[PDB]
Amino acid sequence: LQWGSLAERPMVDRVMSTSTWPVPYYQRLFKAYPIREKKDKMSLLLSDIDIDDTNWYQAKDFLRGSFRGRQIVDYVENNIASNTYILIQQDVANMAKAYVHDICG
Amino acid sequence: GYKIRNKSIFWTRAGWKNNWHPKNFNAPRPSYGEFTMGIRCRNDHHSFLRYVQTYRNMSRHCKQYFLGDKQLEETFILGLRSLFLVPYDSQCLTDQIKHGGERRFVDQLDRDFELISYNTHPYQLFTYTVRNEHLAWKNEQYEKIQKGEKTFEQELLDYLDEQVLAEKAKLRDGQNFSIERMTEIALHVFRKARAGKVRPAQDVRGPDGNVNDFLEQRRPFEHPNPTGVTH
Amino acid sequence: LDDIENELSFHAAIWLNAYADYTMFLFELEEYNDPNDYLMHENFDFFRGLETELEELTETHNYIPGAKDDVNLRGYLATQFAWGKKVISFYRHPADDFKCAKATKNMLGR
Amino acid sequence: QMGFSSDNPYNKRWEYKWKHSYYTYPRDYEHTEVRKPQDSKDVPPIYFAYYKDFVDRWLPGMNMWWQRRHRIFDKFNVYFLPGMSLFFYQFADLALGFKIMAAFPLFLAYTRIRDKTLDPDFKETYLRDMIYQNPEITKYFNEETIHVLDYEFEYLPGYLCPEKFPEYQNKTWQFFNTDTAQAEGFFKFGDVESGATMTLKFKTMPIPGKFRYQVGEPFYFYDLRAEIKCDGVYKEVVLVDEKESLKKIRPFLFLI
Amino acid sequence: ILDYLFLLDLNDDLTRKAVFEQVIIFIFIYCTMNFLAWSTVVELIWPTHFFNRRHSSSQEFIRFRTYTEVLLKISAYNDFFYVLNNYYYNQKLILK
Amino acid sequence: MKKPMAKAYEHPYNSEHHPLNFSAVKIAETFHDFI
Amino acid sequence: LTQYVEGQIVNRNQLTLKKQEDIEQYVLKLVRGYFRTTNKQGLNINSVLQDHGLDEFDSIELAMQVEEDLGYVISAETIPVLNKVKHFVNYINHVEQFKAENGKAPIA
Numbered sequence: 017l018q019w020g021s022l023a024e025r026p027m028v029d030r031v032m033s034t035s036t037w038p039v040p041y042y043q044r045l046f047k048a049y050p051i052r053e054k055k056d057k058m059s060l061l062l063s064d065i066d067i068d069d070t071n072w073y074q075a076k077d078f079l080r081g082s083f084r085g086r087q088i089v090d091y092v093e094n095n096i097a098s099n100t101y102i103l104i105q106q107d108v109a110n111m112a113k114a115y116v117h118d119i120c121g
Numbered sequence: 122g123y124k125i126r127n128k129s130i131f132w133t134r135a136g137w138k139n140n141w142h143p144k145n146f147n148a149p150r151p152s153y154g155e156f157t158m159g160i161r162c163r164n165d166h167h168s169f170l171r172y173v174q175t176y177r178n179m180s181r182h183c184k185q186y187f188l189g190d191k192q193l194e195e196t197f198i199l200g201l202r203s204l205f206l207v208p209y210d211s212q213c214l215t216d217q218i219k220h221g222g223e224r225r226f227v228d229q230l231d232r233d234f235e236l237i238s239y240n241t242h243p244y245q246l247f248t249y250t251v252r253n254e255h256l257a258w259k260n261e262q263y264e265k266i267q268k269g270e271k272t273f274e275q276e277l278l279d280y281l282d283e284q285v286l287a288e289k290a291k292l293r294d295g296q297n298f299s300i301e302r303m304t305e306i307a308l309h310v311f312r313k314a315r316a317g318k319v320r321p322a323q324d325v326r327g328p329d330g331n332v333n334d335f336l337e338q339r340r341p342f343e344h345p346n347p348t349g350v351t352h
Numbered sequence: 353l354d355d356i357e358n359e360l361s362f363h364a365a366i367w368l369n370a371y372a373d374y375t376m377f378l379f380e381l382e383e384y385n386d387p388n389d390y391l392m393h394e395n396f397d398f399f400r401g402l403e404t405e406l407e408e409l410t411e412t413h414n415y416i417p418g419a420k421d422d423v424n425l426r427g428y429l430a431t432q433f434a435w436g437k438k439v440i441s442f443y444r445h446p447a448d449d450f451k452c453a454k455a456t457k458n459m460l461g462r
Numbered sequence: 463q464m465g466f467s468s469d470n471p472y473n474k475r476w477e478y479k480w481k482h483s484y485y486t487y488p489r490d491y492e493h494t495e496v497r498k499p500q501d502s503k504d505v506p507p508i509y510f511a512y513y514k515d516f517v518d519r520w521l522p523g524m525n526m527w528w529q530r531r532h533r534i535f536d537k538f539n540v541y542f543l544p545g546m547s548l549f550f551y552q553f554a555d556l557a558l559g560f561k562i563m564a565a566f567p568l569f570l571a572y573t574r575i576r577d578k579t580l581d582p583d584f585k586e587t588y589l590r591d592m593i594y595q596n597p598e599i600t601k602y603f604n605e606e607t608i609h610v611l612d613y614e615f616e617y618l619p620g621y622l623c624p625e626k627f628p629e630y631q632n633k634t635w636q637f638f639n640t641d642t643a644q645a646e647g648f649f650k651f652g653d654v655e656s657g658a659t660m661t662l663k664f665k666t667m668p669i670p671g672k673f674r675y676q677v678g679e680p681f682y683f684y685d686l687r688a689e690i691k692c693d694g695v696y697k698e699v700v701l702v703d704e705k706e707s708l709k710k711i712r713p714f715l716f717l718i
Numbered sequence: 719i720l721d722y723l724f725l726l727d728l729n730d731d732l733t734r735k736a737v738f739e740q741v742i743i744f745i746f747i748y749c750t751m752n753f754l755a756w757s758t759v760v761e762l763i764w765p766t767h768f769f770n771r772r773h774s775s776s777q778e779f780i781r782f783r784t785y786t787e788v789l790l791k792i793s794a795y796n797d798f799f800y801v802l803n804n805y806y807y808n809q810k811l812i813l814k
Numbered sequence: 815m816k817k818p819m820a821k822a823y824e825h826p827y828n829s830e831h832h833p834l835n836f837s838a839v840k841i842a843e844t845f846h847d848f849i
Numbered sequence: 850l851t852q853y854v855e856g857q858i859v860n861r862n863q864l865t866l867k868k869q870e871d872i873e874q875y876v877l878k879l880v881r882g883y884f885r886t887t888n889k890q891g892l893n894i895n896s897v898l899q900d901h902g903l904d905e906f907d908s909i910e911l912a913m914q915v916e917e918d919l920g921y922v923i924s925a926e927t928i929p930v931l932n933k934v935k936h937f938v939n940y941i942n943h944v945e946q947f948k949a950e951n952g953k954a955p956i957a
């Protein structure tokens with residue numbers, strides 16, 4: 017399928033219009049909305065919500081679509097001693113100690 | 122952008138940002154056994170068990186219309202918990218509500234379950250509509266894959282994978298291909314792909330690459346302006 | 353080593369999913385302009401889900417504005433100069449009544 | 463036995479206590495498992511809300527009165543109150559005061575029937591506070607790990623043995639009361655932490671307290687026994703023994 | 719057949735009371751008034767809901783996800799969102 | 815790719831032109847269609 | 850007796866454990882099958898559900914699944930005390946003992 021030039025932008029951004037005299041007096045009040053259809057656009061409510069359960073749930077959903085992702089999901093839900101799937105890294109204790117146990121060889 | 126300048130915006134007669142016990146004249150006052158003859162009170166200690174049963178009811182009565190969709194059942198549970206965890210996480214001191222916050226929230230959820238038992242709750246109708254549009258889009262991707270065809274999502278990923286290789290083959294001085302750089306590459310493709318949906322790609326020019334589309338256009342003869350005058 | 357290789361992978365996948373949330377919002381926000389010049393029902397279509405929450409308030413007769421909002425900022429802006437400045441209590445239904453009554457040895461329940 | 467009982471399967475011992483904020487009743491009774499969309503009937507038939515209130519509020523209330531109809535068949539409710547109402551009903555057209563004097567004994571009869579037919583409700587928070595103070599029970603039971611397997615509590619019919627309770631051989635009291643207002647039941651408990659079970663049997667009776675005319679406690683446990691069963695240990699705990707309790711306090715003998 | 723059906727008569731209502739013809743005028747007015755008042759109260763909760771759900775969040779507090787926002791993120795994502803996540807996962811978690 | 819479900823539940827009494835539940839949003843759409 | 854599974858009507862089957870070793874295996878499989886459970890292999894008989902990402906509401910969903918598999922009718926008063934794997938095993942034992950002694954299901 018055709019993609020055009022990556023360096024260029026859509027033509028809507030490049031098209032322009034200029035004014036002249038006389039000019040229509042009318043000032044637009046609202047944007048026209050003749051047909052109530054807003055498909056394929058995500059809700060703007062999903063703006064500044066903090067991290068929560070939906071993040072690790074949707075992560076597994078997209079990870080399970082790949083071979084490597086399926087291995088990560090099954091390993092984490094089985095062989096990781098954590099009281100929550102909302103993993104937050106605030107220290108490198110588990111990272112550094114996992115390196116000293118491997119770099120000895 | 123714009124901040125509220127009034128420093129007393131959150132002040133109430135009951136304190137700062139107090140939405141649990143607004144100050145009124147008929148304030149709660151204690152009762153003494155020795156001096157009380159009779160009393161008419163509706164408060165009891167049944168809200169905890171009613172909170173547990175309401176969850177079991179709202180959860181089970183909603184799964185009746187999920188048709189065994191396992192991913193929808195787990196999504197609904199996460200959404201149902203966000204509705205029951207409101208009193209535990211809110212800024213409002215729900216343990217200091219005027220006449221018992223536990224009773225108030227339990228009676229509020231019972232009104233929700235009553236609508237749930239009739240399959241008329243707006244959360245239910247919203248779930249059916251959202252899931253049907255999602256399954257229609259997944260069935261479209263499945264029917265294209267069964268035909269050996271490439272999906273629109275797979276073509277974007279393969280196109281994004283090759284642009285990263287091109288941008289990193291010229292990035293030798295630096296070697297940190299940050300997530301910021303990856304994002305603006307994908308967003309630029311997205312804007313051109315989004316504009317390509319309303320104006321598809323005919324030639325090498327690509328999606329929305331025709332200047333003639335933005336010349337003066339008129340409504341077709343078989344579809345005039347239905348709502349207003351044209352001249 | 354493989355234990356943290358898979359732990360940090362899922363940890364990154366969680367926060368990459370949150371990064372994609374914030375990114376795709378700013379992407380959709382480009383099509384939103386002049387919130388004051390949209391019709392009522394078109395603004396609710398951009399914020400899909402607000403009409404449904406508005407229906408839940410109506411069907412349960414929670415027609416006291418801001419009762420189920422933790423921070424009823426609109427309620428505070430409306431009462432900046434109100435007599436007996438107060439906002440509605442959290443999750444207050446217009447039909448509930450917690451009034452009590454007692455009879456004591458003194459008159460008027462005292 | 464619980465007098466108020468609907469076709470609802472869950473929480474039988476709380477059905478009369480729980481006051482739901484429902485406008486009307488749920489379409490179906492509480493499901494015991496996930497069902498199919500075709501299991502339930504969409505858009506219940508016309509006049510469904512009126513039918514539900516009759517079979518979930520009216521009908522179980524009448525079954526409560528019928529189950530305990532033997533507690534209201536006293537000479538006061540049967541002969542005296544209706545006989546008094548008929549005497550003044552013959553002059554109902556003479557003045558308004560005769561209509562009131564003919565309707566008051568009817569309202570008084572309803573109130574005695576309404577209170578006597580209710581389920582016997584003891585102060586359960588007093589009971590659990592009493593069993594959690596015993597060291598032999600707290601060894602195997604705790605509030606956070608206890609669960610109820612069976613509950614029974616019902617009034618005792620007729621007058622009891624006229625040697626253990628001579629109080630009820632009173633012709634003035636028998637004119638108003640046909641039963642003894644005493645109740646008896648048990649409690650099947652289990653502990654999910656220790657794996658132990660016990661049967662908490664109890665007998666109650668109304669007692670006078672601290673005052674001349676008012677009853678002190680309508681359900682005073684004068685006999686409280688626990689048959690604790692464990693893995694291989696069977697213990698028998700006696701919280702309140704009736705031989706020691708009946709020598710100190712006597713029943714109240716409700717009138718009216 | 720019973721005489722209770724005589725209440726359906728309006729031809730000869732002037733022979734008994736002639737009150738029905740005037741009371742229903744108030745009832746129709748009373749319904750119109752309550753229609754204007756009640757519809758105003760119940761409908762006008764939307765400006766408060768629309769403003770709070772879009773302007774009441776702050777950075778020193780946690781914004782918790784509602785029911786609708788759970789279903790929209792998990793079961794109402796578009797194709798661009800699906801691509802961006804798999805694009806991030808392939809480049810960083812798989813291809814490093 | 816696993817074969818997804820054919821369809822979810824379809825409510826027999828909810829349509830886009832005749833929504834079952836009420837809100838000011840649907841009244842707003844019918845209002846602007848009128849004026 | 851039939852339920853929808855991924856859009857297909859499948860007859861639901863019931864289990865009868867009547868053995869201590871089978872109850873422990875069922876509860877572990879039950880808790881591991883829950884999508885919110887963390888550290889599924891670290892789960893044992895003495896595992897607190899709180900240590901595996903489960904709260905009071907997750908115990909309700911687990912109790913709801915026990916009613917589906919075993920045909921129990923668990924009251925709302927019993928659910929909030931099921932906070933460990935051992936609690937589910939002992940409760941199932943108490944229900945089987947109650948029906949074997951009293952010939953009826955416990956009060957719901």
Ligand SMILES: CCCCCCCCCCCCCCCCCC(=O)OC[C@H](COP(=O)([O-])OCC(O)COP(=O)([O-])OC[C@@H](COC(=O)CCCCCCCCCCCCCCCCC)OC(=O)CCCCCCCCCCCCCCCCC)OC(=O)CCCCCCCCCCCCCCCCC
Nearest residue numbers: 531532535536539540541542543544545546548549550640
């Ligand atoms: C065309 C189609 C439509 C037709 C519609 C018309 C048809 C309607 C039909 C109605 C008749 C059938 C309904 C009743 C059937 C019950 C049959 C039965 O077998 O039941 C036994 C059954 C016993 O069950 P059990 O436990 O198995 O028995 C075991 C042992 O036998 C138990 O042994 P025990 O020793 O313990 O004995 C227990 C027994 C003891 O039974 C007795 O001993 C009998 C006592 C009856 C006393 C009645 C007279 C009271 C006054 C007498 C006073 C005399 C002394 C003073 C004289 C002063 C004179 C001024 O207790 C009772 O059953 C009596 C309960 C109360 C009855 C009295 C109600 C008084 C109402 C007064 C108004 C009467 C108006 C009548 C209508 C006429 C005008 C229109 O009892 C019941 O089921 C009770 C049912 C509920 C009570 C119904 C009474 C009426 C309540 C309605 C309230 C409104 C009343 C009317 C007011 C209107 C004006 C305001």
Ligand SMILES: CCCCCCCCCCCCCCCCCC(=O)OC[C@H](COP(=O)([O-])OCC[N+](C)(C)C)OC(=O)CCCCCCCCCCCCCCCCC
Nearest residue numbers: 133134135144145146147431432433434435436437438755
């Ligand atoms: C015309 C279109 C339709 C309009 C319909 C009516 C619209 C009403 C609009 C709201 C006004 C309602 C006024 C209520 C009192 C507000 C002031 C207040 O809260 O007092 C705080 C007051 C004011 O304190 P303050 O601190 O808020 O203000 C003090 C003023 N400054 C700041 C200048 C010093 O404090 C008190 O404690 C006084 C208590 C007296 C309360 C008197 C209330 C009597 C009326 C309430 C009962 C009415 C029942 C009617 C229902 C009938 C049912 C059949």
Ligand SMILES: CCCCCCCCCCCCCCCCCC(=O)OC[C@H](COP(=O)([O-])OCC[N+](C)(C)C)OC(=O)CCCCCCCCCCCCCCCCC
Nearest residue numbers: 466477478479480481482518519520521522523524526527
């Ligand atoms: C003399 C001839 C008969 C005279 C006419 C008698 C008419 C009686 C019925 C009309 C009056 C009913 C009162 C309505 C207001 C109270 C509603 C109510 O009952 O609530 C129940 C209430 C329900 O309890 P509740 O209202 O406190 O709430 C229950 C608590 N929760 C909600 C937590 C569950 O129960 C009772 O009050 C006790 C039983 C009262 C029985 C009512 C009258 C039954 C009479 C049976 C007559 C049968 C023969 C006639 C028909 C034969 C067939 C044709």
Ligand SMILES: Nc1ncnc2c1ncn2[C@@H]1O[C@H](COP(=O)(O)OP(=O)(O)OP(=O)(O)O)[C@@H](O)[C@H]1O
Nearest residue numbers: 160161162163164165166479583584585586587588
């Ligand atoms: N201290 C109190 N103050 C005000 N009202 C009360 C008080 N105690 C009870 N009430 C009211 O009287 C009713 C009866 O109280 P009661 O103790 O019998 O309830 P209960 O559920 O049976 O308690 P328990 O579980 O201990 O047996 C209650 O429902 C309540 O409305």
Ligand SMILES: [Mg+2]
Nearest residue numbers: 583584585586
């Ligand atoms: Mg009690």
